[PDB]
Amino acid sequence: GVAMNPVDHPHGGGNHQHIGKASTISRGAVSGQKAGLIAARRTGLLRGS
Rule CB under 7 A: is residue 47 a binding residue for RNA? no
Rule CB under 7 A: is residue 48 a binding residue for RNA? no
Binding residues (CB under 5 A) for Mg ion: these are: 10, 13-14, 17-18, 20-21
CA–CA distances in Å: residue 16 to residues 3, 4, 20: 9, 11, 10
For 11, phi then psi, to 5°, come to -65, -20
**In whole angstroms, how close is the CB of 45 to Mg ion at the nearest point?**
9
Rounded Cα distance between 1 and 20, Å, is 12
Residues that bind RNA (CB under 7 A): 1-11, 17-28, 30-33, 36-37, 39-45
